[PDB]
């Protein structure tokens, strides 16, 4: 199981900017990713859903691919 934080179990269209910041922290800790700069994802869930894989990589060269794949996993249900 991915041990998603309780507040992040809402559909991501409803995530706030604070939720997205918590999502980044969860991804980094749960999957032992390299450090992600929270300041490069100052957006809400609707904003996050508009990003392409490349948008993720430009904000996080080291972990952007993983973040996009984790969001895809959540979306696939």
Author numbering: 15 to 91
Reported in the publication:
Examples include the V112E or V112R mutations that disrupt the EH-surface or the A93D mutation that disrupts the ML-surface. To examine this possibility, a variant with both A93D and V112 E mutations was generated and found to crystallize in 2.8 M sodium acetate at pH 7.0. Its structure was solved to 1.86 Å resolution using molecular replacement. The A93D-V112E-PNT domain crystallized in the space group P6522 with two monomers in the asymmetric unit. Most importantly, the presence of both monomerizing mutations prevented any intermonomer interactions within the crystal lattice via the ML- and EH-surfaces. Rather, nearest neighbor contacts were via alternative interfaces that are not relevant to polymerization of the wild-type PNT domain. Furthermore, despite differences in contact surfaces within crystal lattices, the X-ray crystallographic structure of a monomeric A93D-V112E-PNT domain closely resembles that of the heterodimers.
Unlike the monomeric PNT domains of most ETS factors, the ETV6 PNT domain self-associates in a head-to-tail fashion to form an open-ended, left-handed helical polymer. However, its propensity to form long insoluble polymers via the tight head-to-tail association (KD ∼ nM) of two relatively flat interfaces hinders identification of suitable small molecule inhibitors. These interfaces, termed the ML- and EH-surfaces (mid-loop and end-helix, respectively), lie roughly on opposite sides on the globular PNT domain. Each is composed of a hydrophobic patch encompassed by polar and charged side chains.
